[PDB]
Every structure is written in C-alpha cells, then in structure tokens.
Amino acid sequence: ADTIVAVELDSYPNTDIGDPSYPHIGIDIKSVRSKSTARWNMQTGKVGTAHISYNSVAKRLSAVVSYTGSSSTTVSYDVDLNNVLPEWVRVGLSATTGLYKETNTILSWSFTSKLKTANSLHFSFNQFSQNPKDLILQGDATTDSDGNLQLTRVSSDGSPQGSSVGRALFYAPVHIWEKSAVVASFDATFTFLIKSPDRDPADGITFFIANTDTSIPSGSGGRLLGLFPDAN
Amino acid sequence: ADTIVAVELDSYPNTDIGDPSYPHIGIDIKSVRSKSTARWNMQTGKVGTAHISYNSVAKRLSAVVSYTGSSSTTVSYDVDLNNVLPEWVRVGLSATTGLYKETNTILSWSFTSKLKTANSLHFSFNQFSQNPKDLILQGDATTDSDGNLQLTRVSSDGSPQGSSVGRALFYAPVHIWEKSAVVASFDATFTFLIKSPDRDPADGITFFIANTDTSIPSGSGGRLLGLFPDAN
Amino acid sequence: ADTIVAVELDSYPNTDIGDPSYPHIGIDIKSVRSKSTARWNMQTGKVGTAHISYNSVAKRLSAVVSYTGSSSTTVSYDVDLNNVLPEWVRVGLSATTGLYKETNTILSWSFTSKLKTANSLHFSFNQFSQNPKDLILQGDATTDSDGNLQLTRVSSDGSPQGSSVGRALFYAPVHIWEKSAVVASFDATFTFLIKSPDRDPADGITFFIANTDTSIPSGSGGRLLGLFPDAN
Amino acid sequence: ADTIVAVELDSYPNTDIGDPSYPHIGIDIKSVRSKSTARWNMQTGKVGTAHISYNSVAKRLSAVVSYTGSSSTTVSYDVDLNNVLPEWVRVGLSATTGLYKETNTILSWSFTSKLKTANSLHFSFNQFSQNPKDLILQGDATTDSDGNLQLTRVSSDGSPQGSSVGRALFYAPVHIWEKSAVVASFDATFTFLIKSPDRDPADGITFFIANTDTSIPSGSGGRLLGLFPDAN
Ligand SMILES: [Ca+2]
Ligand SMILES: [Ca+2]
Ligand SMILES: [Ca+2]
Ligand SMILES: [Ca+2]
Ligand SMILES: [Mn+2]
Ligand SMILES: [Mn+2]
Ligand SMILES: [Mn+2]
Ligand SMILES: [Mn+2]
C-alpha cells in the first residue's frame, strides 16, 4: 500500500476511530490515527492559513493553522522522516466529504524542499489554472473559474456535495532525502475555504507526502481523508 | 515539429550554416541560425557560468557567459516569447559532439519561472543524483558518480566521445504565460565544464524552452545541438 | 543633490512640467520629466499592484501596474543603471499630495537585488509593523494600526490630507553593481490603495533607487513626488 | 549586557569553563556554557559548511557542520527563542583567536528570516566586497582581496595572529517575532576556512543573534568568542 505522512485538518471528530472529541489538526504517520493532535477552533466560512515545516536535524514535524483575528492551533511530532518515507516522494493535498459535508477549497498552495549534500524545488500556486499540467488531479478534484482548486465536489452555485474525495499532487517527484545528505528540509503553506450548510462539516483536508506513485486507495472516503484504505 | 527557443554556447563555428567565424553565444528563435550572436572567448577546460533571463514587459531575452578571471560575453534579442512559444513548456539543456568533440558537463542547473495574474516554479540542481526522477534524460545524457550531468557521451577516464547528443528537461511542465497574465519572467543559471583533446571542440551546449513534448528531432546531431531537424 | 532613478505612478497630470495630459506611469532618470511614459487608467479606491524589474545585460528598466479585472499599463526605458546610479544605493517608496490629494497607502512592499561576480538581498513587507526598525521613515510617512504604511498624511477616519510628503527607504544599503560584476538585477513589487474625495487625485507614488544618503529635497512637494528639488 | 543566542564551532576545548574535552559544536543560550554540545571532528585546512535553523512552532534550534567527504556533526536544543531574545535583533558572525590561533575565514554567509501574521528578510554573501556597507564590522574583522571576510586578524601571507577578535553583523535589524505572529523561522548558512600552524587551533567561530545594539563586550576574547563578558 502507499506510505503516507500527512498533516490533517480534521473538521469531523470520528471518535469511533480514535479522533479526539472535537475538530482537530493532527500529524499522521502511516495511519489516520494521528501520532499527535491539537484542538482546532474551526471557523467555517472563513479563509484559513495552514503552515507545515520539517528539517532532518531537528526531526520535529510541525504545523500551524490560523484565520484572521483568530488564535492559532499548533501541533508537532518528533519523527525522522527518513525512517518513514522513501527518498523520492510526491507531495499533495487531499480532502473528503462524507455523510456530512463542506467545500474543500484551496486558494493557494506553496511548497519548498531543500536537500544539502544545495538542491531545491519550490512551487507557489496562487490561482490554479483551468488546466494545471503541473498538477496530477485525482478523484473529484478539479480547478474552477475563480482559479480555485476544489478538492471535493461542488455544484455550480458553490454548494458542496457529500461522499466525495479528491487530491492534487505536484507533477514532479520531490527528492527529500539521500544517502550522502547533510540536511533536508521542507515547508508548505496552503490557504483554504471550508463552507458548509451542515452544523458539523466533514471530513477535512490534509497536506501529505507519499511514495511517488501514490493514489486514492480503495475505501479511503469520508473519515479516511482519501489517504488510507483503513483506520488501523 | 518542436518549437524551440534556445540560448546557445556554440563552441564550433559552422560557417556553412551561417555561424559567425568564431566560437559564439547566440539566441535561437525557431532556428539554429541565431537571431543575434556575440563572440565568445572560450576557455576550454575551465568551469564556465551561463545566466539567461527574460520578462514579458521588457520582452528582451538576454544571456551572459563568464569564467573566473575572464571577461564576459553578453547577448540580447528583442522578442515577445508569447508570440513564439506555447503557454506550457518544458525547459531543458541540450548538447552535442560531432566529428570534433568535447565533454558537455553540467555542474549545476537552476531555474526560476514567475507568472503574475504570483505563480512560480523554482529548481536548483547542484549535484545531479544517480537516478534523477525529476529529470527527463534524452539521448546519451546521463548523470555520473561525481554528481555531474553528462549531456554527451564520455568514457570512464572522462574522455569525450564524438557524434553524440543528449538533453535534460525538467520533469514538470512550466507555465510561462497565460491569457490573464500581467507579467511573466524566468531566470536560468548553469555551470559547465567543456574539456577537449581537440584543437577546435564541438559542438556546444544550450539552455532551451520548448513545447511540452519536445524530443531530440531526427537528424539534429553535431551542429544542430540536438535542437532542430535542419538548419533552416 | 541626490541621484534619482524612479518609477512614477503619477495620478495628476502636471502639464506645465511636461506630463502627458492624463494619469500616467513613467520612468524617471535624474529628472521628474519621465524619460518615457504610458497612459494609466487609474481606478481610485481599488487595490493596485505595481511591478518593477531590471537586469544589466538587457539594460531595459520596465514597470507594470494593474488591478483586478483591469487591463494593465506597462512602460520600459532602455538605460544602463550603472551609468546613472552609484554602486551602493538605498531603495524606497515616495508619495505626495498637493493642492489636490489622495491616500498613498502601501499594503505590501517587496524587493530583490542580485549581484553576480551570487550576492543577493531580499525583503518582503506584507504588514508594516507599528515601529519598523528596518525602515527609514522620511517626512510624513508612518505606519498605522492595520499594518499599512501611509506615505502621506491621513486623519483617523482615513481621510487624506493635502500638501503632504513622505518616503520609506529600506534600512540596509543595497549593492546593485560592482567593478567585477557579471550581471546585476533587481525586482520590486508593491500593492497600493489610492482613495480620494477629489475628482482629480494628486500627486502620486514612486518606487525609487538613490544615493545611499538620499533625503526629501527642499521644495520637492506635490508634483515633484518628494523626489527632486525642481522639475528640470 | 547583551542578550546572546549563538551557535558555536568551538575549535578549542576550554575544560576550565565546562567545555567537553574535545573540539565541539554547541548551542549557547545567554551563556558560553553551551546548553547542549556535540563532538566535532575538525578538519583544519578544509572548507567547512555550517547550517543553522529554527521555527517557533517546533521551538527546536538545530545546527549541522560538515566538509566534503566527512561525516557531519549535528546538535539541537529545545528552546523558545521568544522567551529569550527581543523582537528586533541583529544577526552576525563572531570569532576569536587566543593564546593559540587559527584563520577564521568566512567564504559565504547567507540568512533567511520569516515572520507570519508573510514578512521576510534574506541576504546571501558569496564574496564579501572590499567595503561592505551592509555589514557592521566590529573589532578586528575585515574583508580582504579574495572577497573573504576575515573575522580575526591575519597577516598578508595569510598567517593568522593570536589574541584577536572580530564580528560581522548584518546592517539591517531583523524582525524575528511579534505579538500577533503565527509563526517565525530563520535559516543560516556559512562556509568557513580554519587554518592553523598550531596543533590545537583556537578559539572558534559562531553564528549569533542578539539585541540590536550588540557589541564586543569587554573581556570577551579567546574562549569567550567575542560574545560574553564572562563564562557564567
Ligand atoms: Ca475525522
Ligand atoms: Ca555551430
Ligand atoms: Ca504629475
Ligand atoms: Ca572553547
Ligand atoms: Mn483525526
Ligand atoms: Mn551558432
Ligand atoms: Mn509625470
Ligand atoms: Mn564551548
């Protein structure tokens, strides 16, 4: 199966699969059952920023999510990503809706990888083109006329649909480690719009890094954030 | 056929196809017969730096080549690259040897594309990995144990072979223009090592931008820098 | 006196000092009488973006100004900035109001300088702190509680005042050229808000580069954009 | 007194002031007595690279030092730099020689600061100009004709002198934190040449961040790395 390292903005507490009992952000290391989590004060309808960062000396993966005039949620986990992930990866964004739903809109996505022996890859998407040839679009993910990436299905009045799933990987494989490396790092930012007619929107959004040929595993919908085939 | 925009470091004057009568750098716009050229004082055996730059307001494509303690060669041509190239391109490096030869070694390759409506792609290769999955290697181009990209054939004592050709494109398509754009730019740097047992080394090296599915055209060897099927 | 190279967003046609008879953008080379200009469709009240760029091989200084859903204004002038400016400079933003007025609000300011022999300086101000120790504030320029730089005077209901002038230079001197250089470039972006209760707002805004100890020259108010002591 | 956060490449074990009994790298938090250290296999005469990095979510300051074909030394310390340093700082490089000596040559210095509410400052010095107006040179630090910064005294045959001290701060104050910040980070790289006719060279080199008006404290020579007035 795929190897997944992901940072989840889980809008729906699925307490049956070990989620805390509130909307949380979390760090997922080969399982949907976050290695660590923090409580997230979700402001649905408001534009949120997420930042993710990691270097291989500190070996502490950390994320932060905020909105204008809101306090932030931060989470960190100590892990060495070379003991988890292959040397070549594809990075991407995943989202799902389930029986309950939301718009999983991405307004901007930026990413930096650095590998010293300095090699680097950077990309910055501030408006997603109508045909983004440097993206791999998986499942229901599309771009739209406002230059937004819609990870999960919406209808043409911008109403979100349920039981949906989608992802966007950067086209190019990213080299995040090698034998002779001295130090690797990456950073990642996306802005996002989560809108929902539901009291409790679902299911969330992730930034994620994976084996290069990653794909939406069978059965990974709703709570599994198009990421895992099961909640082990 | 492919659409080529290229910056040539032509080590061999092929005066039969309109090259000036000396080693030159040149700007090629859909033909090997440079739109403009300048004389290049080649120092074979020495590490050279080339820089290429362009923005769509100035609409002046310009390049500069130097070595330590050498004077530089600069060349520029006025052209609008949106009237020449498609909106999505692949960027790359090409080189050939012919009846006469050289090592076409690339020690570093870096590239920045910017598209304002800001979108950007950056990459920086300072040591080319043994299996560069973010490169498309075409013809005889390979990487080697020093972390160099060898565009054209060498033997294991580093001796160059003749009648050779190779290219390296960045894996990801680059978005260099769109309908609604305000301004696009790109920059490009490579360092290179040209070594030759011959009095007059051949044939040269280019940085080049092309239609996304570009490939070494039939018959493009030696003087045609793996770029064009003919010298029209 | 100071040596000024500036890019003007001149909201007020001062036809008595050679301005075209409409709102224009222009490139100023040691004089307020732009070396070249283009017509600018000003949308007062709307957030505008300006981009400026230059490299010393092309030797073409160019600028572009746009707003969302507006067409852009572009201008370029061929000049070698090493034959004009010293090797060490301070870069900054200037604005004035005169008998007629506007808010000269800067929402973001970013700048990149590159000097190859690669040396570089970058800065990016997206919200201007309440006490910006890396800025030199000249004349009436201040920052405000929204994290905006107000180049020219406003009152606390955001109403602009007339006969005003201000500038913001980056604290650090920027090295834009040297003897042994192969190639220098710079880029600059600011976003701005021009609001006015007047039919014809005045006087404008500039990005500018100058001798390191530059200061608001005596008499440089209104139409002289806090830049020149006279309109020669 | 100054507030110092520093990363030391301590070439001389001063076991009388709590240094481990070998050449070490270390993280100094308001004292020369490193909060944490690691053993450093010094290769005097060889060009070394040091990298330093930090973000305020992970709150783990970490450094790595290597040379070509050498294994690396890495060190990390958990600390929140907002509970230690002011909001505005100057960053710099310090070095000393003592009764024993070395050349403290810096071939390149690069630095990135990022502050999200994104503000950023970057600089990259690959050859230090003969008169670096964007540097504050303190004590014996000068630049030289090879475009190297010599932190500590050398004579004109490149022989190092003893009992010396010098520093180089970036001219501009750096904004590394504020009240409303979501996340701050910085990164820093320098390359260095330590040469010595002595069996046991002294005293070392640091990258350091400090109150904005920092200066070489009285008595801070040799083992105190021009950083602290005493070894408390
Ligand atoms: Ca969940
Ligand atoms: Ca030729
Ligand atoms: Ca005017
Ligand atoms: Ca010591
Ligand atoms: Mn969860
Ligand atoms: Mn030619
Ligand atoms: Mn004018
Ligand atoms: Mn020590």
Side-chain angles (χ1 to χ4, degrees), chain A residues 1-67 69-232, chain B residues 1-67 69-232, chain C residues 1-67 69-232, chain D residues 1-67 69-232:
Chain A
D2 291 349
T3 297
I4 304 295
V5 175
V7 167
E8 50 160 66
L9 281 53
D10 191 335
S11 58
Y12 203 95
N14 293 94
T15 62
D16 41 338
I17 57 151
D19 274 351
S21 205
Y22 38 86
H24 53 279
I25 74 161
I27 281 144
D28 300 344
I29 311 275
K30 298 194 284 182
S31 172
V32 82
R33 301 179 173 270
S34 294
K35 279 338 169 202
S36 85
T37 67
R39 187 191 279 265
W40 170 45
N41 196 28
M42 277 182 354
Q43 314 245 320
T44 109
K46 270 113 131 272
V47 174
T49 307
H51 301 86
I52 307 96
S53 73
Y54 172 90
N55 79 78
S56 58
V57 177
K59 289 182 285 170
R60 170 166 285 158
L61 163 70
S62 83
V64 55
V65 196
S66 61
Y67 317 77
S70 282
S71 58
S72 87
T73 316
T74 66
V75 74
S76 308
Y77 184 62
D78 289 345
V79 54
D80 181 1
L81 292 187
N82 189 52
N83 295 161
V84 166
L85 274 163
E87 299 199 354
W88 291 89
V89 286
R90 273 215 173 81
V91 305
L93 303 174
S94 104
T96 59
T97 60
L99 272 261
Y100 283 112
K101 70 188 155 291
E102 61 201 26
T103 68
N104 296 293
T105 309
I106 305 307
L107 290 71
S108 57
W109 182 31
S110 106
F111 171 86
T112 307
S113 189
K114 148 293 195 103
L115 210 214
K116 272 93 173 225
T117 277
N119 282 23
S120 69
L121 170 86
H122 176 70
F123 66 88
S124 208
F125 303 119
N126 281 340
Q127 72 105 253
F128 292 87
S129 91
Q130 39 270 296
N131 190 13
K133 292 206 172 76
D134 54 345
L135 284 183
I136 307 167
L137 296 173
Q138 289 170 318
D140 317 322
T142 47
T143 58
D144 77 16
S145 54
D146 297 332
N148 294 348
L149 167 71
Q150 286 303 352
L151 281 176
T152 45
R153 192 63 205 252
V154 299
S155 31
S156 29
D157 62 341
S159 306
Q161 286 155 66
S163 285
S164 185
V165 64
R167 314 153 147 197
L169 323 168
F170 187 67
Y171 189 41
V174 186
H175 203 196
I176 48 158
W177 190 251
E178 48 179 349
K179 64 331 275 73
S180 83
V182 157
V183 53
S185 63
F186 65 84
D187 288 283
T189 301
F190 60 94
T191 64
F192 58 94
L193 192 33
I194 305 181
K195 294 197 273 185
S196 193
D198 294 335
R199 244 184 185 253
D200 305 69
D203 264 280
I205 312 183
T206 73
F207 170 77
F208 76 96
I209 309 168
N211 51 276
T212 203
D213 49 311
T214 186
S215 57
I216 307 176
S218 211
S220 52
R223 66 248 234 141
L224 268 28
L225 293 329
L227 283 204
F228 299 96
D230 63 50
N232 296 171
Chain B
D2 291 349
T3 297
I4 304 295
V5 175
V7 167
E8 50 160 66
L9 281 53
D10 191 335
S11 58
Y12 203 95
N14 293 94
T15 62
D16 41 338
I17 57 151
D19 274 351
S21 205
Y22 38 86
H24 53 279
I25 74 161
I27 281 144
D28 300 344
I29 311 275
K30 298 194 284 182
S31 172
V32 82
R33 301 179 173 270
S34 294
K35 279 338 169 202
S36 85
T37 67
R39 187 191 279 265
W40 170 45
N41 196 28
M42 277 182 354
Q43 314 245 320
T44 109
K46 270 113 131 272
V47 174
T49 307
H51 301 86
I52 307 96
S53 73
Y54 172 90
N55 79 78
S56 58
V57 177
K59 289 182 285 170
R60 170 166 285 158
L61 163 70
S62 83
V64 55
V65 196
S66 61
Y67 317 77
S70 282
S71 58
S72 87
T73 316
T74 66
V75 74
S76 308
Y77 184 62
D78 289 345
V79 54
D80 181 1
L81 292 187
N82 189 52
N83 295 161
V84 166
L85 274 163
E87 299 199 354
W88 291 89
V89 286
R90 273 215 173 81
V91 305
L93 303 174
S94 104
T96 59
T97 60
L99 272 261
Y100 283 112
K101 70 188 155 291
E102 61 201 26
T103 68
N104 296 293
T105 309
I106 305 307
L107 290 71
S108 57
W109 182 31
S110 106
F111 171 86
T112 307
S113 189
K114 148 293 195 103
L115 210 214
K116 272 93 173 225
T117 277
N119 282 23
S120 69
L121 170 86
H122 176 70
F123 66 88
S124 208
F125 303 119
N126 281 340
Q127 72 105 253
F128 292 87
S129 91
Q130 39 270 296
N131 190 13
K133 292 206 172 76
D134 54 345
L135 284 183
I136 307 167
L137 296 173
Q138 289 170 318
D140 317 322
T142 47
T143 58
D144 77 16
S145 54
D146 297 332
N148 294 348
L149 167 71
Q150 286 303 352
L151 281 176
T152 45
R153 192 63 205 252
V154 299
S155 31
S156 29
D157 62 341
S159 306
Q161 286 155 66
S163 285
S164 185
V165 64
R167 314 153 147 197
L169 323 168
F170 187 67
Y171 189 41
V174 186
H175 203 196
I176 48 158
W177 190 251
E178 48 179 349
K179 64 331 275 73
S180 83
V182 157
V183 53
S185 63
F186 65 84
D187 288 283
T189 301
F190 60 94
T191 64
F192 58 94
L193 192 33
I194 305 181
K195 294 197 273 185
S196 193
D198 294 335
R199 244 184 185 253
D200 305 69
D203 264 280
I205 312 183
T206 73
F207 170 77
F208 76 96
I209 309 168
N211 51 276
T212 203
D213 49 311
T214 186
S215 57
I216 307 176
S218 211
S220 52
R223 66 248 234 141
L224 268 28
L225 293 329
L227 283 204
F228 299 96
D230 63 50
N232 296 171
Chain C
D2 291 349
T3 297
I4 304 295
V5 175
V7 167
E8 50 160 66
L9 281 53
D10 191 335
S11 58
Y12 203 95
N14 293 94
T15 62
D16 41 338
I17 57 151
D19 274 351
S21 205
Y22 38 86
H24 53 279
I25 74 161
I27 281 144
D28 300 344
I29 311 275
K30 298 194 284 182
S31 172
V32 82
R33 301 179 173 270
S34 294
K35 279 338 169 202
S36 85
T37 67
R39 187 191 279 265
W40 170 45
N41 196 28
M42 277 182 354
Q43 314 245 320
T44 109
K46 270 113 131 272
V47 174
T49 307
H51 301 86
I52 307 96
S53 73
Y54 172 90
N55 79 78
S56 58
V57 177
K59 289 182 285 170
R60 170 166 285 158
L61 163 70
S62 83
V64 55
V65 196
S66 61
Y67 317 77
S70 282
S71 58
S72 87
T73 316
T74 66
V75 74
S76 308
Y77 184 62
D78 289 345
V79 54
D80 181 1
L81 292 187
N82 189 52
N83 295 161
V84 166
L85 274 163
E87 299 199 354
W88 291 89
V89 286
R90 273 215 173 81
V91 305
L93 303 174
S94 104
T96 59
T97 60
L99 272 261
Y100 283 112
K101 70 188 155 291
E102 61 201 26
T103 68
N104 296 293
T105 309
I106 305 307
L107 290 71
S108 57
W109 182 31
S110 106
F111 171 86
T112 307
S113 189
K114 148 293 195 103
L115 210 214
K116 272 93 173 225
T117 277
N119 282 23
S120 69
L121 170 86
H122 176 70
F123 66 88
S124 208
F125 303 119
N126 281 340
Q127 72 105 253
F128 292 87
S129 91
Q130 39 270 296
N131 190 13
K133 292 206 172 76
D134 54 345
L135 284 183
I136 307 167
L137 296 173
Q138 289 170 318
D140 317 322
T142 47
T143 58
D144 77 16
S145 54
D146 297 332
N148 294 348
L149 167 71
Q150 286 303 352
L151 281 176
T152 45
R153 192 63 205 252
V154 299
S155 31
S156 29
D157 62 341
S159 306
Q161 286 155 66
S163 285
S164 185
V165 64
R167 314 153 147 197
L169 323 168
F170 187 67
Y171 189 41
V174 186
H175 203 196
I176 48 158
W177 190 251
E178 48 179 349
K179 64 331 275 73
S180 83
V182 157
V183 53
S185 63
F186 65 84
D187 288 283
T189 301
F190 60 94
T191 64
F192 58 94
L193 192 33
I194 305 181
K195 294 197 273 185
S196 193
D198 294 335
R199 244 184 185 253
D200 305 69
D203 264 280
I205 312 183
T206 73
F207 170 77
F208 76 96
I209 309 168
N211 51 276
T212 203
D213 49 311
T214 186
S215 57
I216 307 176
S218 211
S220 52
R223 66 248 234 141
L224 268 28
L225 293 329
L227 283 204
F228 299 96
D230 63 50
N232 296 171
Chain D
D2 291 349
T3 297
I4 304 295
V5 175
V7 167
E8 50 160 66
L9 281 53
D10 191 335
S11 58
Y12 203 95
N14 293 94
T15 62
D16 41 338
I17 57 151
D19 274 351
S21 205
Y22 38 86
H24 53 279
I25 74 161
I27 281 144
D28 300 344
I29 311 275
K30 298 194 284 182
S31 172
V32 82
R33 301 179 173 270
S34 294
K35 279 338 169 202
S36 85
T37 67
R39 187 191 279 265
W40 170 45
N41 196 28
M42 277 182 354
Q43 314 245 320
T44 109
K46 270 113 131 272
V47 174
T49 307
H51 301 86
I52 307 96
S53 73
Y54 172 90
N55 79 78
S56 58
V57 177
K59 289 182 285 170
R60 170 166 285 158
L61 163 70
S62 83
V64 55
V65 196
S66 61
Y67 317 77
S70 282
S71 58
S72 87
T73 316
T74 66
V75 74
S76 308
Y77 184 62
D78 289 345
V79 54
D80 181 1
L81 292 187
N82 189 52
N83 295 161
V84 166
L85 274 163
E87 299 199 354
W88 291 89
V89 286
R90 273 215 173 81
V91 305
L93 303 174
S94 104
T96 59
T97 60
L99 272 261
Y100 283 112
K101 70 188 155 291
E102 61 201 26
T103 68
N104 296 293
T105 309
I106 305 307
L107 290 71
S108 57
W109 182 31
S110 106
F111 171 86
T112 307
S113 189
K114 148 293 195 103
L115 210 214
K116 272 93 173 225
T117 277
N119 282 23
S120 69
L121 170 86
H122 176 70
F123 66 88
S124 208
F125 303 119
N126 281 340
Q127 72 105 253
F128 292 87
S129 91
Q130 39 270 296
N131 190 13
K133 292 206 172 76
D134 54 345
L135 284 183
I136 307 167
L137 296 173
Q138 289 170 318
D140 317 322
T142 47
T143 58
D144 77 16
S145 54
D146 297 332
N148 294 348
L149 167 71
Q150 286 303 352
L151 281 176
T152 45
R153 192 63 205 252
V154 299
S155 31
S156 29
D157 62 341
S159 306
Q161 286 155 66
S163 285
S164 185
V165 64
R167 314 153 147 197
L169 323 168
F170 187 67
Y171 189 41
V174 186
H175 203 196
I176 48 158
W177 190 251
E178 48 179 349
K179 64 331 275 73
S180 83
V182 157
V183 53
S185 63
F186 65 84
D187 288 283
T189 301
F190 60 94
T191 64
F192 58 94
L193 192 33
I194 305 181
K195 294 197 273 185
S196 193
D198 294 335
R199 244 184 185 253
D200 305 69
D203 264 280
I205 312 183
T206 73
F207 170 77
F208 76 96
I209 309 168
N211 51 276
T212 203
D213 49 311
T214 186
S215 57
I216 307 176
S218 211
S220 52
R223 66 248 234 141
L224 268 28
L225 293 329
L227 283 204
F228 299 96
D230 63 50
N232 296 171

